[model samples]
Target: PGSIPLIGERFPEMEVTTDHGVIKLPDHYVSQGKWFVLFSHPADFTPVSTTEFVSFARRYEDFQRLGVDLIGLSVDSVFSHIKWKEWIERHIGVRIPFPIIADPQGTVARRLGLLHAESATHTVRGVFIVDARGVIRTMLYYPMELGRLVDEILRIVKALKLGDSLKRAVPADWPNNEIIGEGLIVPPPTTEDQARARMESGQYRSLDAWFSWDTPASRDDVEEARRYLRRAAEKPAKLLYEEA
Candidate 1:
């Protein structure tokens, strides 16, 4: 199966076996207005994969609180998937609060293009983030020795949600960008007349019409709207918000 979903395409519709029973892909979360992530690991028992799973499991609450669902996949059997979850719970005391997909014959992996050349028998670290509307928005592929940063995935999802909700372009290391701090970028004016009008309105800080920036919301507004994202900091913070 050479079908691989690209960004902006609708996620494939399918029902596959899982530890928590067969759950429909993409649409399950889409129907609930939840942005979701489907990630694949190489195998279940390995050290690296174990560590990555632990990271994701530990951060499950953060992801859920942001209105996102996580689904892990591998060629490992459902038994392996459950046993791994049990072992992690015993050793690390973190229950995998999310369901895992079981793709024993590599059928699902092949369909998603996860079976790359790096490890023929193992699926690559493939992550697909889909929006609430069921459109694939981001894809990350990691080969051997390149263990992914779970925080990075969380940040990407957060950025996507904020970008869509606030209609602001997030900067590099956003909310902590060195240059702008927590400033959100505005869509630049397309014509000189609009540029002049923008500058005259005093709504944005612009060096020129080509570049302008604005805040997503007042600090108090953000504090009430997305207080879950608030991390107490003595130095810097943000006012990123979504409408209530």
Candidate 2:
């Protein structure tokens, strides 16, 4: 995928048919509250994809418990998908618990920007987790030569949920349940009250003047947000800073 989707894009609905049924993509969102993951494999019956699906199947319950739906996509026939599902349950001893979309026409793949003209007809390894309101939250991609790590996928889902709840970002290699520190690129406040809220909040630091929550690159994390704001600004603030 050349241009990956960002954190605030609504997923487009694809008309697809599965082994068990056929349905539109948006139906999942309207029916399941917030739509979640959209993962893709190159093709059915491929060795690498087989292992990836197996790992995902093992962790299906964990995602379901979180009210997040996991969807797989590939340019394979519906019958092939059904057969693959059966093989997993019978030989692999685990049943696939998520919906796998059949995109034999390559329509969905093109729509997702996962299709490459010069590449193989199969879909590439693209993973996306879209939020309930339809904005995409997470995007992960890999090559067909390598298999995916299920633990990392689970950790990402959890970390994203945690970040949403805490309004912060998970540092590198941060696992599930870890504290997400300072938010990424918070909007700059533009009013006296707004600035007071930002300057007073222990989490908001760095701005120099009224109505601005600036994160000065030089200030240490230990400095009080208000203190840093006043000190960094060169002049005293005209309005009183009060905690909300």
Which candidate number has the best lDDT? 1
How well does candidate 1 score on lDDT at residue 78? 93
For candidate 2, the TM-score is 0.72
The candidate that achieves the highest TM-score relative to the unseen native structure: 1
In angstroms, the error of model 1 at 127 is 1.1
**TM-score of each model, in listed order:** 0.83, 0.72
Cα lDDT tens digits, model 2, 1-244, are: 3545566777776557866587667666646675578888988888889888877876677677656777888998888888999877776677888888888888788778786544658777888887667777777777778787665666666656655654444555442113323323344455789667666776644334422222222233212222323343445344212311
Local accuracy of candidate 1 as per-residue lDDT tens digits, 1-244: 3457899999888888889998888778988999988999898878788778877876788788889999999988999999999987777666887888999888889888998878878898999999999999999999867788776787778777777877778777666678776777887566889667876788777766566788784574334333323422223353212211
Among residues 3 or more apart in sequence or in different chains, the pairs in candidate 2 whose N, CA or C atoms overlap within 3 Å are 34-132, 206-214, 207-214
TM-score quality measure for candidate 1 = 0.83
Q: What is the C-alpha RMSD of each candidate to the true structure, in Å?
A: 7.4, 14.7
In Å, residue 72's CA in model 2 sits off its true spot by 0.9
